[PDB]
Structure formats: structure tokens, C-alpha cells
């Protein structure tokens, strides 16, 4: 995230984090992270990959989260080049 002036986070589903939720893929109000290690316990959020949000990131061993189309639109609009 050092490529811009600030970090970027996404709110994690309180049902997914506590047990399960199957809607994050296209309908839930929050994000569903595959890599549970990316979730910050201090705020219930995941750091978002500024390469996928602006161009492309697809490496299965990434350091950040890649949101589904529904959530991703908010972060595509959240980027330094737009906001
Ligand atoms: Zn959910
Ligand atoms: Zn990435």
C-alpha cells in the first residue's frame, strides 16, 4: 500500500468471522476473506491489494485481500486516483 498516501481496509462479515456466511460473494454488506490470517482483530478488517483494485493481482500467496465485485466497487472508488 506504500504506492499511495494511505492504507486500505475492508470490513469483514461478523457472521463469517464467528461461524459462517455464504452471501459475501455477491450480496452480503461486508467482505468474506479466504486467508483468515489477513484479518486485524483490533478492528475486524482486512488489508486490500492496491494492485487488484487498480490493475491486477492474482498470485495465490499474496500479502493482501482481493474483494468480490460487490465489495470491490467501494474500494475501486476508495483508491487515491479517485478519492
Ligand atoms: Zn456475510
Ligand atoms: Zn494481491
Swiss-Prot record:
Protein's cellular compartments: Nucleus; Cytoplasm; Cytoplasmic granule
Subunit (UniProt): Interacts with DDX1 and YBX1. Interacts with HNRNPH1; the interaction in RNA-independent. Interacts with RBPMS; the interaction allows cooperative assembly of RNA-bound stable cell-specific alternative splicing regulatory complexes.
C3H1-type zinc finger segments: 7-35, 43-69
Organism the protein comes from: Homo sapiens
Family as reported in the entry's similarity comment: Belongs to the muscleblind family.
Annotated protein name in UniProt: Muscleblind-like protein 1
Function: Mediates pre-mRNA alternative splicing regulation. Acts either as activator or repressor of splicing on specific pre-mRNA targets. Inhibits cardiac troponin-T (TNNT2) pre-mRNA exon inclusion but induces insulin receptor (IR) pre-mRNA exon inclusion in muscle. Antagonizes the alternative splicing activity pattern of CELF proteins. Regulates the TNNT2 exon 5 skipping through competition with U2AF2. Inhibits the formation of the spliceosome A complex on intron 4 of TNNT2 pre-mRNA. Binds to the stem-loop structure within the polypyrimidine tract of TNNT2 intron 4 during spliceosome assembly.
Taxon lineage: Eukaryota, Metazoa, Chordata, Craniata, Vertebrata
Tissues expressing this chain: Highly expressed in cardiac, skeletal muscle and during myoblast differentiation. Weakly expressed in other tissues (at protein level). Expressed in heart, brain, placenta, lung, liver, skeletal muscle, kidney and pancreas.
Disease named in the record: Dystrophia myotonica 1: A muscular disorder characterized by myotonia, muscle wasting in the distal extremities, cataract, hypogonadism, defective endocrine functions, male baldness and cardiac arrhythmias.
Amino acid at each position: 500500500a506504500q504506492k499511495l498516501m494511505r492504507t486500505d481496509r475492508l470490513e469483514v462479515c461478523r457472521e463469517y468471522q464467528r461461524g459462517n456466511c455464504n452471501r459475501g460473494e455477491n450480496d452480503c454488506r461486508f467482505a468474506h476473506p479466504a486467508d483468515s490470517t489477513m484479518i486485524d482483530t483490533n478492528d475486524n478488517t482486512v488489508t486490500v491489494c492496491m494492485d487488484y483494485i487498480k490493475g491486477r493481482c492474482s498470485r495465490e500467496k499474496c500479502k493482501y485481500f482481493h474483494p468480490p465485485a460487490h465489495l470491490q466497487a467501494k474500494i475501486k472508488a476508495a483508491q487515491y486516483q479517485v478519492n
